[PDB]
Every structure is written in structure tokens, then in C-alpha cells.
Amino acid sequence: IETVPVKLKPGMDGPKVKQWPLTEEKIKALVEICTEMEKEGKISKIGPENPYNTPVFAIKKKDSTKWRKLVDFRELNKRTQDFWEVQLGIPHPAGLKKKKSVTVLDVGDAYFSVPLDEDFRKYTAFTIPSINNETPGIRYQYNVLPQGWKGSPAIFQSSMTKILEPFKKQNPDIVIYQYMDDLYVGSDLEIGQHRTKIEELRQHLLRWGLEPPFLWMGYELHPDKWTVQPIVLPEKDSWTVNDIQKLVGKLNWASQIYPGIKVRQLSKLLRGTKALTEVIPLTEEAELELAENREILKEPVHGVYYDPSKDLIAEIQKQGQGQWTYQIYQEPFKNLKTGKYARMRGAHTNDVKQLTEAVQKITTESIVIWGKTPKFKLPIQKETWETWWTEYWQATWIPEWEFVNTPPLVKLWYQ
Amino acid sequence: MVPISPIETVPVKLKPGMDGPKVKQWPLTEEKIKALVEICTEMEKEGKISKIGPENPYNTPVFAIKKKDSTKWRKLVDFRELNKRTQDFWEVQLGIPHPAGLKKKKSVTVLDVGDAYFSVPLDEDFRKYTAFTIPSINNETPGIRYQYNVLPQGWKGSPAIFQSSMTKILEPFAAQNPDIVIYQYMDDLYVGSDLEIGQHRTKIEELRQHLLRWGLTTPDKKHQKEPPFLWMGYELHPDKWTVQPIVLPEKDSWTVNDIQKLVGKLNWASQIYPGIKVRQLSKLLRGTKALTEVIPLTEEAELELAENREILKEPVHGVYYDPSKDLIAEIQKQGQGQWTYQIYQEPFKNLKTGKYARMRGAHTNDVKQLTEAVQKITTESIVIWGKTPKFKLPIQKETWETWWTEYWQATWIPEWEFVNTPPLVKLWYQLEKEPIVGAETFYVDGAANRETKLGKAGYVTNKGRQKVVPLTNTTNQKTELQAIYLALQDSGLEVNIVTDSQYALGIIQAQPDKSESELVNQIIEQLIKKEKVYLAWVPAHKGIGGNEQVDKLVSA
Ligand SMILES: Cc1cc(/C=C/C#N)cc(C)c1Nc1ccnc(Nc2ccc(C#N)cc2)n1
Ligand SMILES: N#Cc1c(N)cccc1F
Ligand SMILES: [Mg+2]
User: What is the rounded CA–CA span in Å between residue A375 and residue A326?
Assistant: First the structure.
């Protein structure tokens, strides 16, 4: 109820980010939401002496009918002081990724109970545009901790720890981790048990609150069942010239990740200038080399470590037929996680919706495993992504991304 | 007296660390000084400025300009220095409405609010920074010192604060009268509606009564401006719109600057005149910016100019937006990277038109360009109408399906239907997913020496067919492409090709149908003639048969 002092980083002005174009349905929804928020004292109209801006849009969280306001604070988040007064966003819990069930709660509504430092409010300015700019955009700033701002969980942390003290000492094996507007709650219980403990948790925030529009929701994860992608080589009885060339190509690539991979004996099978479809019998020497390579590929990659000071990088490849592969790393050839998807939701004829869902799922995995979001290298033209991703977005955070314009030859090797 | 509501002041600051201006007042002639004193005495009587003591240390220069063909002098306070020191403001005029998003109106009335402008007070704590000095006659007494109490003309914050103040005043009227639209441009309010003239004029009277609550008077003798409005380069009429007249000059010889003005006119025209083209005329501006240099018009630029004159022969108008009807966007390929489009709701009545040009790049293809044009029109349509139009595109549904399912990137175009209007966008070649049984296998390679620029390109095949060609003035990259070209030239209609060139694979996997490289263009032409092509990559220098033999032949 008393404001925590907040500053930007030294020699750093507030965000001045352009509002991107919004559809009629999203403008109508934001007008309605913001009219309510203004009545409830959460935001106030501002004047022209405030030149700052952060983009806003609206989303429908997974399995809902109601619009949620989403402010894109990525720039304000970069420019905001780091929060190390005492608690450092909690050392990441390494056991959250080992629980049988992790439920994700939207708890962002709790932040609106804490006022925002009067001198920092101007930097939260945003604009509801009008269609065709026919009427002046509606300008607001926040009076309370906003959803999506890095400072909100930091400032609210003290109050959140106190809300869940009763639930924590009652359920000491439960891992509870907060990231931005999400609360991640991991248990090893049976799911019907789990959902009841989750509902138990909701009541603590319902009772403290006295209504949160999306607190009732639950995104259920099962990180103990998360699958990885080791390198595997074909097992064949008939190898064509083409098959062996593909094998030597994949092994050459793997030898950058794994030291002792050899291709000398396999290449020797191709001596001459043969038709691509001709079948070549494996010699014993080439078969030995191949088995030795298979054995190397069963071991972990050497010298792989996570450094919390370095960015995580996520790469994604489109494999076709709705399948997507991805790798998360900090240094080239030192993958920290690899994976593959196919069950991409109601998007069998929409590549870009599938990629947007993939991006969300990888970011969620990143949050659960390291407590931060990765920087994506997306296989899509910037203009196509920027026109469409907000139509499919269902998360309350937004990662960073860049665009891949040249086809990677390595897509073949992750297939 | 009738009490009036005050207009709330906007708090204003100088930029961090900066102080107000302290600019020397220029010397003035005795005649200019007497004119300024008269002018400022009137302004002071009106409350716009106030005399200040000598403690204020700030100053901005003031000038006297002869209003041409009149014995009347006009005052100019030059606020350039204070503007550099004044904070940035939120600017609303950044986005201007496009006429094609407006709605038809039966009546549009104009109201002058020039007098309202200076009922807008300046933040009391900022006034000191607006100080200026009229010099005295013969400089024998202190100059007269004044500061502003209202928003000064030419000060950085005046447009934003005036707009914000009027918007706040108009907000309740607009909300409680949803059957009118109101727009502020300069010192005028435009009020439009679909009411019968009686009710419409009643709304105007009520607006004047609303404005009086703040003491803002509007002239009784109604405005001289009446439809059509000349606004931001457009002509707005009650039920249609167009661009102001576009007249391409006749010229025997053309300058850099003349071509820049011609392209600007054409670009402006292209939003309602269908089919305008500017590629060949913009090609003449490549690189150079010597505004007076003359450039010969190529025959292709003259053809383009001629075509544009024909398009601009007679007026064309757009219609306004009917929110009850779908928006449709149709696109045509024009050639040389150019695309043109029309957005309409009823057949043959365009809301607007426009064009798209191929981005600068080494390689491209029509499907990619069509896709970019669709995204551009989509985003423009969200701005203007708040929704995506349904598209009519010159590409078969089966062509698109093949393209996007096989393309290495994610790609999407929103709801659309095929329109069978040539030229159609098609896939000129598709590579095989698997090696071709019975097709000859060419192992290609090239190499070059970086010092001599001499190289070799060639192939060897499983049938013993072989070729090596010596090359001059070349590079490793060029020789690798040359080798693939030779294999395409010398093979039958089905061919397997094995290369170690990651560079060539990167190009071919991008599926270009046109390139800045004439060698890539030659490869594309050969690919179009084949029935089946499978392109296989192997790593270099790994003892792979075929590849090893040809690498030795070409690196010799
Ligand atoms: C942007 C705008 C500029 C002008 C005027 C600017 C100036 N000068 C006048 C008005 C009233 C508006 N605002 C809107 C809003 C929605 N529909 C319309 N339709 C509309 C406007 C003018 C005419 C006419 N004639 C017809 C329809 N105008
Ligand atoms: N003009 C105008 C206007 C409007 N149409 C709506 C709201 C506030 C405003 F200032
Ligand atoms: Mg070589």
C-alpha cells in the first residue's frame, strides 16, 4: 500500500514504442476492459506531456471466451532497473521440471492490489488506437502494478510469500514458482488429487482478495514426460549410394558435436562414380565404424553447462506434416534441450499458427527448466510473422525473436 | 456574467538538464518597434501576454515582418531555441485517416474555433521561459519585457496541447451524440452526420452551446468552406473521395529532381488510379542524388510514363466504407517485381487501390512476392478498416498448397479465392524428394584460385560422361554454380545431381525463379525444361566417390 521506489537504468529514457494496428474486435474489447479498469482506479487518462508508449493488444487465453488485455512491456522490461534489493527473483527451483504435474495459474490480477510508484507511472503509458485514426487514441497509464511488467512480481513478491505460507507448510512437497504473471505449481500426486490441491491454492488468493477474471483457469503440464531428440542413424539391410551419402553427411555434422565420429570407412564404400540408386553392401570395416559411431551417439555431449548470465537461444525447423523440431542452446553444438512436436492444435492448414504454438510451448519449457525465456530464431519472413503472431498468441509473456532467411542445411539432420 | 469552466493546464518541462533560452534580441528599426508595441499592447489587453519585471533572465527574439502588399506589420516571436529545450510531447496527428476508411455522410458542417485556441492557458510555471523583449526607441530606455500566458504560435508544445484540450472538451458531446462524427483540423471542427438537415443543424447549435460552457465562441456567419474539402492532398465529397488533381508535366529533358517529383506524384496517384507503375522511372534514380543532373529516359521508362499518362487521363474517384459489407482485395502481377491491387465492396466501385514493389534482394520468386503483397495489404487494411479483406489472387489453390506444404519456412495467407486472370503465379520447377531410378547421376564440382581468378567447373557421371571447362575471372562460388549448370545442360530430362556446394544448395533450396545473377537465371531456365531433378548434397573432401574424382579434376 506504500510504493516501492522504482527507477529506470542509468542514462535511459522511457519506452517510445509504436502501437501496431489492431482489429476492430480487439479495439472494442480493450475499450471495454480499460473503461472498467479506469473506474476501478487501476489506470488513469494521461495528457500530451507524457510522450511514452508501450503497445497493447488482446488475447483469448487457452480455452476461454473472454478477452484478456496484454501489454507488450518487452522494451520497458529491458529499460527497468534490476531488482536485487533483497530477494533475487528466487534461485531457480531445479525440481519443478521433475514433477509429474505442473499447473500454470494466471495470478496477474493480484498485482492490481499494489499501487505503483507515482514517479514511475508515466513510463507505463499505452494507447488504445481507433480504426483509421478517426478519433484520438485513448491514452492511459497505470496506477497499480501492471500485468506483464518485470517489476510487478518483484514488488509483489513480499506479499505473495505471505499469502501462500499456510498452503506451503501444509503441502511441503509442492514446488511453487512464479514467473511474471504465472504461478507454476508442481506436484507428484495423482491428477484428481493434483487438481484439488490447485483448487485449494485458488481459494487462498480468493480469500486474500476479499474478482480475478482468469484465476479459475489451469494449464496442465507434465514435465516428467517431456521427450528429447538424441541423434539416431538408420538401421538398414540395403544401403543405396544416396543412403550412404546422407549417412556420411549426417555423421560429418554430428562430428562437430561429438569428437570421435569417423566417416573414413563409410566413404570408402562409395569408391567410383556410382548411380545414386545403386545398392552398396556394407563391408565389415564400414559396419564396425558405423557401430562405433552409434555407440558414441548414445553418450551425452561433452562440456555442456547452463550459464545463467548468458542468453538461451532456441532454433526451430519446419519438418512438414505438422512436425517441428527445436533445439535450445547457449553455445553452438552444446544443446541444453532438443525436442520435437507434431500435435499442433487446430492448425493443420496454418503453418504460422503452428509455429506460434511451438514458440509458446518452447518458452514454457524454458521457463520451467531455467526460469527465463529464450531468444528465438524463427524460420519465417519477418513480415509474415509480424502480421499474424498476435492472432494466435495465448500466453501472458512475450519472448524475443529474430528471423532466419537462408534455409539451414541442418534441417535434414533433425528429421 | 455566466461562469465558465477553466481549461485545465498541461504541466510542461524543459528537457532534463536544460535551462530556458537566453537569446539576444536583434536590433530593430524605429518603424518596426512602434508596430510591435501597438501589436503587443493589443495582445496584452486580450490577456495573451503580460509585462514582466527585470528579474526574469530568459529571452527569445522577436521580429517584424511586412505582410506582403499591405502597410500592416506582423509580429514573429522566433521560438526555435526554446523548442530545442522543450520536452517531447505525445503527437496525435502522426496517423492521419485515409479517405477510404471514412463513412459516407449526408451533411458535414465546419465550425471555426480559432478564438478557442487562446482560451488555452500555458502552464504557469513554464511561462517565464517564453519571455521576449521589444527594443526601445534609440535604445535609451529598458526594452519592454513580456511573457506568454497562452500557447504561443510556433512553440513546440502548442499543437499537442491545443488538440488535447479540445479533445477533452469534445469527448462528452461525442459520447452522448453517437450519431455524429467530429474531426479537428487546424482551427476548424468538422461535424458530419446522416441526420436530416434540421436535426443536423440542431446538433451544431448544441455543440456551440456545449463549447460555450468553456467560453469558446464560434462565428455566427457560418463557414465559407463547404464540400468538397481540400485536405491533406485529397478531395473529400459527401459520398466519394479522390486525390487532388495529378498533372504530369510535359518536358523535353528530365532532371534527377524532376524524376523524384514525378515518382512522388505517381505514388500519390496510385492510391485510387489503378495500375500506376513506377519501376522503370525509379530505376533512373538508382544511387545518384545530384538534384540537377539530367538523365536520358530509357525506352522502357518512356513506355511506363506514356502508360501512366493514359491512366491519368480523366478523374477517378473512390467510394467510402460500408461496415455492413465484406471488404475484397484483388491483386494482379504487373511484371518486373511490380504488383497492383484494388480493394472494393461492390463490384467496380473501389474504395482504394495501390501497388507493391519487389524488395531488394539477390533472388526471389513470384509466390514469395505475392505473399509479401498480401501481408502489406492485410496490415494496411487493419489500419484503415480494422479487418482483413477477403482476397482474390491469381494463383491456383493447388499451386499454393504445393508451395506452402513443401517450403522450408512457415508461411500463410488469409482467406482467399483463385481469380483466373493472367498472368497467373505458378511454380516453375519442383525438385524431387527422392533420387530418380534410371536417371543418370552427375557429380559436379568447381574451384577457383583467388589470386589468378582462374578456375574450372565440371562433372563426371555413372555412365562415364565427363566434362571440365576452364574459366577466367571467376570465384569458388561462381564455379560451383557453373558446374550445376553444365550438368543440367548436358543431361536428359531426368537427372540426379550431386554437389558439395552449400552455397548453391542454399540458393536452390530458396526456390528462386529470378535472380540478380545471370548464372542462377541460366540454372533456373534449365530446371524449367527438365521433367525430374534430384539435387543431393555431400560434404567436401571426405573421399566420397564421384565427388572426389571431379574435385580433383577442377582444382587442378
Ligand atoms: C477525418 C475527417 C476529416 C474531415 C474533413 C477534413 C478537412 N478539410 C471531416 C470529418 C468529419 C472527418 N471525420 C470522419 C469520420 C468518419 N467518416 C467521415 N466521413 C466523411 C468526411 C467528410 C466527407 C465530405 N465532404 C464525407 C464523409 N469523416
Ligand atoms: N474531434 C473530436 C473528438 C471526437 N470525435 C471524439 C472524442 C474526442 C474528440 F476530441
Ligand atoms: Mg572442391
Answer: 12
